[PDB]
Symmetry: C3
Subunit: 597 residues, 3 copies
């Protein structure tokens, strides 16, 4: 009896003609995409120039100090100090300071609608040469005359001081550059590019024309060294109510640029995909997307440095590598990418492939740029990855498809041998199978309880000596009480009624046979025992393939410096001060009490 019973039994007769089936034809294997045409080239990326136009100048003024003093016995107290900074008149700058490096001990200027005049020491005007300032770590240059305050003499009236001061400083002007400031925190409400030449008079000024002046062929005389006329300039000279500042007038457009060069890309591969271009600098790990057309520097505001810098850089680069390997291809091309980034691009071709497409590339505004260039480095990554995995996986499907094609060539010859099995496998269920011409006549098989099956001890034929069986005989019943059938066993638990599986008696006749969960054994055509597959050392026909799915992962908010670490980086907080300062009175004083008597 079927000891090992963790299986099902089947009985498969010759499958009646109907039904008949056919194998699926070879499938059309997919094709590798032609790929993606990339254009090798050099690129330069500009950015919204948030940097203020920087230049240098010179301040000329005098620190006037009028002091009143009250004299008492064995003591003295300041009664009211009046400090002011007054301009050094135009002529006093040209004829006095520049030429000789001197300055009047007197100050004459308009203040509060009147011609006030101050005399140092309250003594007749004496011209006094200038001397370098004192200890000044990390400070631009500066000179002056007076070094001591003047106070009234002993008694029981007033004293005026006049220190002609001149300082070299750093000036900072920002778009639209209609005005600028200094390192002293002093505003100057005139465009640094104001003047007369170049129609500079068009530029902005808040002052009367008589205040401003513009000296031509001006030879500055560097004090201290006393050196002079190193270079002639068109010295602009404005006279503020509090001082007189001057600087070398320079052209606007050439000196400024609303954009700043950010990156020099040696190889910026350019490709089209979806009505846009693709610039991927693998060197920097970045990818930009731009419309198909270019961008005229004409619509740009004061972006003169742009074209200038682009050319210089590119030509510079083309001379390091490409000058031998490749060759230029048309005039510079400019495209604008998302995030407000301007891309200067010059295509390249190696002699190996020795254009018209490059042609036909063609108020005022200004460009804004995103402080974050991550969306691009992201795109870059994704694409380079996606593109890869796709281009790769595709190759698989093809080979696979092709494999299944060749495999069929095998299934064809195979079905000839064991249709009953081959077909059963191709139908995913035990079925009777036989070849009816080129197609296959088939009819399902029938399940049989293993508990109802038992084998005969004899593989021999009492009625036919000399000859024996090739397969031991068996008996079974579908139902729990069903009739008993004299059918012989076939491969893989099939119950072949027709007992025509025979073979002449053989010497040294060992043989194992599939029998339920395990096998059955027979020595010399005589039964032996049943066993489990475990006993028989199993060998595999499969090519192993160990795979592991990519695990998850958490990306936590991570920052190098929180904005608060920045609001603190500022050594001085203008808000902290003014708050505490304008709160000073409230803390240490009462502003509501009135007194009288």
């Amino acid at each position: 009896k079927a000891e090992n019973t963790d299986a099902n039994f089947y009985v498969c007769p010759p499958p009646t003609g109907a039904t008949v089936v056919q194998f699926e034809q070879p499938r059309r294997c997919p094709t590798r995409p032609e790929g993606q045409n990339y254009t090798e080239g050099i690129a330069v990326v500009f950015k919204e120039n948030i940097a203020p136009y920087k230049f240098k100048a010179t301040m000329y003024y005098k620190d006037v100090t009028v002091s009143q003093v009250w004299f008492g016995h064995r003591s003295s107290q300041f009664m009211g100090i009046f400090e002011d900074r007054a301009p050094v008149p135009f002529e006093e700058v040209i004829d006095k300071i520049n030429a000789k490096g001197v300055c009047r001990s007197t100050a004459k200027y308009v203040r509060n609608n009147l011609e006030t005049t101050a005399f140092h020491r309250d003594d007749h005007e004496t011209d006094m040469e200038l001397k370098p300032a004192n200890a000044a770590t990390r400070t631009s240059r500066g000179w002056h005359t007076t070094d001591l305050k003047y106070n009234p003499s002993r008694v029981e009236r007033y004293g005026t001081t006049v220190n002609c001061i001149v300082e070299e400083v750093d000036a900072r002007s920002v778009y639209p550059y209609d005005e600028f400031v200094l390192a002293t925190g002093d505003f100057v409400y005139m465009s640094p590019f104001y003047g007369y030449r170049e129609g500079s008079h068009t530029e902005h000024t808040s002052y009367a024309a008589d205040r401003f002046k513009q000296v031509d062929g001006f030879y500055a005389r560097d004090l201290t060294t006393k050196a002079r006329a190193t270079a002639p300039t068109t010295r602009n000279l404005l006279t503020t109510p509090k001082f007189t500042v001057a600087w070398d007038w320079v052209p606007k457009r050439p000196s400024v640029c609303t954009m700043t060069k950010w990156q020099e890309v040696d190889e910026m591969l350019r490709s089209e995909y979806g009505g846009s271009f693709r610039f991927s600098s693998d060197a920097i790990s970045t990818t930009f997307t731009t419309n198909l057309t270019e961008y005229p520097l004409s619509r740009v505001d004061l972006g003169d440095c742009i074209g200038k810098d682009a050319r210089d850089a590119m030509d510079r680069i083309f001379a390091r590598r490409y000058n031998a390997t490749h060759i230029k291809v048309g005039q510079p091309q400019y495209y604008l990418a998302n995030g407000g980034f301007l891309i200067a691009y010059q295509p390249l071709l190696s002699n190996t492939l020795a254009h018209l497409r490059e042609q036909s590339r063609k108020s005022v505004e200004r460009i804004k740029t995103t402080s974050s260039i991550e969306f691009a480095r992201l795109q870059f990554t994704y694409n380079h990855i996606q593109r890869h995995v796709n281009d790769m996986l595709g190759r698989v499907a093809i080979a696979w498809c092709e494999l299944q094609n060749h495999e069929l060539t095998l299934w064809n010859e195979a079905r000839k041998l064991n249709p009953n099995a081959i077909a059963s496998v191709t139908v995913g269920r035990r079925v009777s199978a036989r070849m009816l011409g080129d197609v296959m006549a088939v009819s399902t098989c029938v399940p049989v309880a293993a508990d109802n099956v038992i084998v005969q001890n004899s593989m021999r034929i009492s009625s036919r000596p000399g000859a024996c069986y090739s397969r031991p005989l068996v008996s079974f019943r579908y139902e729990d009480q069903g009739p008993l059938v004299e059918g012989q066993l076939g491969e893989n638990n099939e119950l072949r009624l027709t007992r025509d599986a025979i073979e002449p008696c053989t010497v040294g006749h060992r043989r194992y046979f599939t029998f339920g969960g395990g096998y059955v054994y027979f020595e010399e055509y005589a039964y032996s025992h049943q066993l489990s597959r475990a006993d028989i050392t199993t060998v595999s026909t499969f090519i192993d393939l160990n795979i592991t799915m990519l695990e998850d992962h958490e990306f936590v908010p991570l920052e190098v410096y929180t904005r608060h670490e920045i609001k603190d980086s500022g050594l001085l907080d203008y808000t902290e001060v003014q708050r505490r300062n304008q709160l000073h009175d409230l803390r240490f004083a009462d502003i509501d009490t009135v007194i009288h008597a």
Copy 2:
């Protein structure tokens, strides 16, 4: 003799019963995961409102200027100018400026604990109408009375000036909004929401109640246009020691919000995975993670705009697309993600699938947000990729497993034909193989030196004319001097002793046979020569599969603007100034010398 000897030889007899082996059964192929259920919906993302509460007001004050002058022959010098900014009294604002647009030529205010009174021109009080300020590019509005300083008349006392000034400015208050400032850099130590209505008196104030006032049904009269009563307001009026500022009192909570709307997401797919939710806006390329529960706006501080804005936006969006395709699903849902981001989410369902889960979603504090939203766009990416590669690779393993299943169906029939080979392959080593029942009796093969093997010139049988051999005869010896065996050759360098491979003599009898590194040839059962595989044009049975592993790549530190490019973007550096300014004295003066006589 075996000329081509870059190979090994084997002799395979009928493998003795022991040992016997079995093929590995079909393996259980993995199953596709049910997938990931995504919930379609609309979302809105708020952020820590770092923006200061912005509002407008009006300043009212007078620029008082007392000047002392010393008169000399042919000259005159200011002896001490005293400038001050004094408030314009309450009544003077309501009865004078508002109604008629005028202002007194006199200033009466408390300063340093006393009732000082200033008269413009030192002349009896005259009411003077106000006039718009002068040229003012990029400046809010402003008016005034006086336009010239008043100085003492010729001699050899003092002159007071009074310019009633009023300016429209921009006020800025920040959390907790207990106070605010102006564009003039003037602090006002009172909560902008202070007053009486709405229990505003609860709000913060550093001033006595008599200073502050709150006019009801106030009809402002726009100067210049002289238009008036366009709209009535509850004008708040505070009087600082230096001026009198006023503004329309407004409610707090409605006007402010500690959070600001950042992004309107049309489709924010929501899914659960690992006790958290998944909101992936594929449009923006971002993914947020939130706890399973919601977040009550109750724990929020003054976050009233939140719910308001969320509703407006969502309903707005639902009317563009979803209003036809989908339908709302319950009240708005709010979840908090990592990085301090608040997510407003409203689920959606198309009629095709026409909830309780949405239910059961349920001092004071404030939310902080990370300035970097990259950890999210990272997560988003990773997942969308990982999830893909996994979902894909899985499909492979399955198909593969299935392939190996079907493949077995072939290996079964195949072993019947060339067990000696099929098995040798399944054992990874040359072995003798024969079918013992359903299993396979096997016994390893034996290596034989090729240098010891030589073939016989004759494939014919001198003793048996008419008939010949199907395989030429050979001889060999295992050892270097071992006995010589009369065995015939079998397929693939097997040495079948039993010389029973025969065939009747055939006409036009060409035949090639595997012979060491190459082959051996025989014409008409008579030897010819040996050759190498090279000669025979080889054909492949393999389906090619060209693969390439993803190359490495370097991600270099890349920034659009270094923090230093920012510390410079600021036109004015409060630190640069105050340093140079407070260093001014050290550079151009001595503070250690004392004088007397």
Copy 3:
């Protein structure tokens, strides 16, 4: 006739000896890389300390106020208020304020080169105790004496006020820490670490030595609480022209550090690849690249906290997990990664694997750090992904290669059965194939028009009763008028001339046969009809594999806060103010008009 004609026909004779071919040998399957050796360890990452050295001090000064008043009938006006802040002399700080908490009602100090003396109320010196300031929300502590300004008495001279003020404030010094400032916005041009001990005199000072002092064993007496001598200190005392500030002198190097601890990494796997190291904190999702050598803290400037903090942190961590599982491995190791990031790393080994490599790890400068740590989190990601996909795909190629190896074992036995087909498949074109020894004699097949082919109704043999054909007879012609050949049909549209495919007549003889686009049917060896494959329910032999390529995706510029949202976050804009302020005069005054008479 061939009704279904969407196919081609072929005639295949026994392929003449030439030409002959051979199958491709098994290919050498690739090997799994040994992998990547990772070193488990703990790490700590420092960063460019952009934070200013923070410490506390105390200001001591007096608010002197000299006021002149003009008296008139029924009125009075300030004629000129002179406000000044003067220092509280050294002795007055030690003997008066510290001990008793009092201060002189008089101020004696040098101003404008003279010994001015101020008396509160202009009355003989009286010592006045100090009292806490008034209402002060979010302000450090502060005390004072006077609380009211002093003004001249009724008439028709001057009044001086003296408010001894002392404030606790927050001091801020930045590299090189040669000077510092206060919360009052007051600069102090002396290195906070100046003094005498520790050779502090080396530090920077802009003042004469007599101004600065350094009290030893100083016991501060906390006012209000009047508590004293809680702790003795080396009180530094500098006396600026405007005040006298003091603070506890402390060592420099220990108190400061040009680097700040950023992240404590529990597990920072370290590995080598391409002459550099690999530190991947999977916890944070980050990867750093450093040279093979270390970095001496010797080249570091004032980076003392570094080693200190590194040790504390690490040892701390090693006591939470590793103390039991792993064991320390040598002294701390420091490497510098790109982006200016310093990595403190301590390797680890579990007892399971229980070093020399760790050894041999070995003016002044300072480190700069990138504000963006994304290039790293990028690298991290890419690698972890790339490495995965590679390590995975590889496994495929191998298994695949191996599969094709085993597959051959099948192709060998298969070709024996249907060479004509097997070979045709291996040649990618219909060819005649037969086994010539071990190789295969082959010769291409010939295409034949289907329109020229017709089958015979009889599968029977009139001349040979009892026996019949196994394959119906056919006729055809290559050319459009070519000769008619008596060849029988073979499998797959082959035209086997030799009509030797026979079989005895059979009962119930159904049979289908491939016939052009469809099939042909015969009942009892008598023709029936033709049909299309559609009729016959097709069954597949292929293992399906549904794949999908990863779709594209757009990464749009996305920012949490634009830099402009930051330029606004600042409650006060020093530029806005000074612009409007220094523009005040232009708006409400004329600076070009002169008057006289």
